Amino acid sequence: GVAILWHEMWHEGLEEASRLYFGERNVKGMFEVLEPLHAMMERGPQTLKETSFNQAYGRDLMEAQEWCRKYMKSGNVKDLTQAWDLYYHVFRRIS
Amino acid sequence: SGVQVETISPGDGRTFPKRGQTCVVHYTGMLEDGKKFDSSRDRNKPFKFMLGKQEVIRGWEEGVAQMSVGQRAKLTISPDYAYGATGHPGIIPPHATLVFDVELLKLE
Ligand SMILES: CO[C@H]1C[C@@H]2CC[C@@H](C)[C@@](O)(O2)C(=O)C(=O)N2CCCC[C@H]2C(=O)O[C@H]([C@H](C)C[C@@H]2CC[C@@H](O)[C@H](OC)C2)C[C@@H](OC)[C@H](C)/C=C(\C)[C@@H](O)[C@@H](OC)C(=O)[C@H](C)C[C@H](C)/C=C/C=C/C=C/1C
């Protein structure tokens, strides 16, 4: 039960992030789990299973980061919810 | 405290959402005064969630459970059952009475 593959990592990663932000109001803590996962996408896929994940969900996840960057500049929490609407879409399809 | 439910349109009666099943709904959340903060009807896509696993707030956890399939209703949720003293920053302030219109379309 250790997350090697990207869909496994993104599943428990978003579950941890969502618990921190919505459950406990921890915005900084929510980014600390998100930002490393997004950074591994930006490095790029190695395996076939990583590439097929990036084809399916990579555009949605990169858009969710762009909304997260818009929250950092603006400060309006409405931008942060738009990211979490995209994060929920990718979570259910993995689930 | 609590969650006062008031029906808009009636359900089938017999079919209820058990533990394990994924409640597919349409909803509209609005504040105590009237102003609207979130709505799935405006997005034109329904919202799915697994009941019984503490996924949603306490008003939904008891309020949606008592509803039958194909039933529209107005759930006036108290701040005890809602987000409460902390609230949800920049959307729901401290000690808010949340009015939730909701329609349980499909049990799934
Ligand atoms: C941008 O979209 C937001 C929702 C916005 C966020 C802002 C809100 C004002 C509101 O606009 O919805 C709103 O209208 C509202 O008030 N809603 C929504 C509909 C039902 C009632 C109520 C409403 O209960 O929502 C809930 C509260 C926020 C947190 C809950 C309250 C109960 C409490 O025990 C719980 O503690 C952990 C936090 C948000 C839920 O979303 C349904 C989502 C799906 C659930 C969670 C964050 C957690 O459970 C989580 O755990 C680890 C999970 O298991 C899920 C399955 C993991 C997954 C990765 C999370 C994805 C995030 C999705 C975010 C979405 C869809």
Author numbering:
A (entry chain B): 2018 to 2112
B (entry chain A): 1 to 108
The paper states:
Rapamycin and a structurally related immuno-suppressive natural product FK-506 (tacrolimus) 2(16,17) bind to a family of FK binding proteins (FKBP), which catalyze cis–trans isomerization of proline amide bonds found in peptides. The most abundant FKBP in the cytoplasm is a 12 kDa protein termed FKBP12.21 FK-506 bound to FKPB12 mediates immunosuppressive activity by binding to calcineurin and preventing translocation of Nuclear factor of activated T-cells (NFAT) into the nucleus. Thereafter, independent studies identified a mammalian homologue of TOR.25−27 In time, this homologue became known as mammalian Target of Rapamycin (mTOR) or, more recently, mechanistic Target of Rapamycin. As previously outlined, mTORC1 associates with auxiliary protein Raptor (149 kDa) while mTORC2 associates with the auxiliary proteins Rictor (192 kDa) and Sin1. To address these limitations, we have developed a novel class of “bi-steric inhibitors” that interact with both the orthosteric and the allosteric binding sites in order to deepen the inhibition of mTORC1 while also preserving selectivity for mTORC1 over mTORC2.
Due to the prevalence of a seco-product when bi-steric inhibitors containing a C32 carbonyl were dosed to rodents or when subjected to mildly basic conditions, we sought to prepare additional compounds that would be less susceptible to forming a ring-opened degradant. To test if modifying the C32 carbonyl of rapamycin was a viable direction, we reduced the carbonyl to a hydroxyl group to give compound 11(81−83) and also formed the C32 methyl ether to give compound 12.54 We then measured the affinity of rapamycin 1 together with compounds 11 and 12 for FKBP12 and affinity for FKBP12-FRB. In addition, to understand the differences in binding affinities between the rapamycin analogs 11 and 12, crystal structures of the ternary complex of FKBP12, the FRB domain of mTOR and compounds 11 and 12, were solved to 2.8 and 3.1 Å, respectively. Elaboration of C32 to the methyl ether results in a ∼1600-fold decrease in affinity for FKBP12 with methyl ether 12 (Kd = 701 nM) relative to rapamyicin 1 (Kd = 0.44 nM). The incorporation of this larger group necessitates slight rearrangement of residue F47. Despite these differences in FKBP12 Kd binding, modified rapamycin cores 11 and 12 were potent in a FKBP12-FRB TR-FRET assay (EC50 < 10 nM), all being measured at the assay detection limit (entries 2 and 3); however, differences in the affinity were observed through pS6K inhibition. The C32 hydroxyl 11 maintained comparable activity with rapamycin 1 (pS6K IC50 = 0.04 nM for 11 and 0.06 nM for 1), whereas the C32 methyl ether resulted in a 6-fold decrease in potency (pS6K IC50 = 0.37 nM for 12).
